[PDB]
Design an enzyme around this catalytic site. Structure first.
Site, PDB file in Angstrom:
ATOM      1  N   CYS A  65       3.033   1.524   9.787  1.00 18.48           N
ATOM      2  CA  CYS A  65       3.198   0.582   8.987  1.00 18.48           C
ATOM      3  C   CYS A  65       4.365   0.436   8.338  1.00 18.48           C
ATOM      4  O   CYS A  65       4.954   1.379   8.218  1.00 18.48           O
ATOM      5  CB  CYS A  65       1.786   0.596   7.864  1.00 18.48           C
ATOM      6  SG  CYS A  65       0.319   0.169   8.195  1.00 18.48           S
ATOM      7  N   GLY A  68       1.113   5.188  11.099  1.00 17.86           N
ATOM      8  CA  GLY A  68       2.267   5.765  11.828  1.00 17.86           C
ATOM      9  C   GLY A  68       3.478   4.446  11.444  1.00 17.86           C
ATOM     10  O   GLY A  68       4.552   4.563  11.705  1.00 17.86           O
ATOM     11  N   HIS A 102       1.114  -0.934   0.290  1.00 16.37           N
ATOM     12  CA  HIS A 102      -0.031   0.055   0.432  1.00 16.37           C
ATOM     13  C   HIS A 102       0.935   1.530   0.167  1.00 16.37           C
ATOM     14  O   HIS A 102       0.339   2.088  -0.090  1.00 16.37           O
ATOM     15  CB  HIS A 102      -1.074  -0.273   1.354  1.00 16.37           C
ATOM     16  CG  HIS A 102      -0.381   0.338   2.438  1.00 16.37           C
ATOM     17  ND1 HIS A 102      -0.794  -1.210   3.288  1.00 16.37           N
ATOM     18  CD2 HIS A 102      -0.368   1.409   3.182  1.00 16.37           C
ATOM     19  CE1 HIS A 102       0.048  -0.834   3.829  1.00 16.37           C
ATOM     20  NE2 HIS A 102      -0.711   0.862   4.458  1.00 16.37           N
ATOM     21  N   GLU A 112       0.334  -8.597  -0.016  1.00 19.24           N
ATOM     22  CA  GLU A 112       1.251  -6.865   1.065  1.00 19.24           C
ATOM     23  C   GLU A 112       2.988  -6.947   1.615  1.00 19.24           C
ATOM     24  O   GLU A 112       2.670  -5.859   2.068  1.00 19.24           O
ATOM     25  CB  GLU A 112       0.622  -7.103   2.178  1.00 19.24           C
ATOM     26  CG  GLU A 112       0.119  -5.173   2.840  1.00 19.24           C
ATOM     27  CD  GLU A 112      -1.161  -4.172   1.492  1.00 19.24           C
ATOM     28  OE1 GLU A 112      -1.454  -5.036   0.929  1.00 19.24           O
ATOM     29  OE2 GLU A 112      -0.114  -3.540   1.678  1.00 19.24           O
TER      30      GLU A 112
END
Length: 182
Positions: free
Chosen positions: A148, A146, A41, A72
């Site tokens: 990730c 904050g 992402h 991911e």
């Protein structure tokens, strides 16, 4: 404070950089040579900022499992003038559950942050922001925006990178040794 925080600190101080994309600042784990990882992402493009230096992206691959399901993790090769310490021997070979993990973050917003998240479950399937995702680790800590890209470790192992939360639980994508064979 203890041997868990010791191993986490050892990884953070040599194997992380601050990555900035148009989607924000992330903790970025360097694994070997000029190869790092970041949550998919983050939407890595042809140029990324690494510790506030403009850096060409030589390759970026958004990993999927052999069911063509999102994992991911994006593996990025950076046009950087310096290699990372090779930490691939700290990666697990198989999917597993863990005791007593630490989530470690280093950005402008959260420098030198370490969180003892406790027991880690092999959760498996997660609908992550509307995207079916596999190989998810779960921990019962109210992680926040904050974190990730944060590195999840046990003593002796680097097991995942933080990719999301639901306010009560946090979720990490597994790192496996097989992702970084060369």
């Amino acid at each position: 404070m203890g041997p868990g925080f010791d191993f986490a600190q050892a990884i953070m101080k040599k194997n992380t950089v601050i990555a900035r994309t148009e989607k924000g600042e992330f903790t970025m784990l360097g694994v070997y040579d000029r190869v790092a990882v970041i949550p998919t992402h983050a939407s890595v493009g042809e140029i990324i900022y690494i510790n506030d230096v403009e850096t060409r992206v030589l390759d970026a691959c958004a990993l999927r499992d052999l069911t063509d399901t999102n994992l991911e993790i994006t593996i990025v090769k950076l046009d950087r003038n310096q290699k990372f310490r090779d930490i691939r021997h700290f990666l697990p070979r198989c999917e597993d559950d863990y005791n007593d993990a630490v989530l470690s973050v280093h950005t402008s917003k959260f420098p030198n942050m370490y969180i003892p998240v406790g027991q880690v479950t092999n959760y498996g399937f997660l609908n992550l922001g509307g995207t079916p995702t596999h190989r998810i680790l779960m921990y019962n800590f109210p992680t926040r925006a904050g974190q990730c890209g944060g590195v999840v470790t046990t003593t002796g192992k680097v097991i995942g990178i933080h990719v999301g939360g639901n306010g009560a639980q946090g979720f990490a994508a597994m790192l496996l040794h097989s992702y970084f064979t060369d």
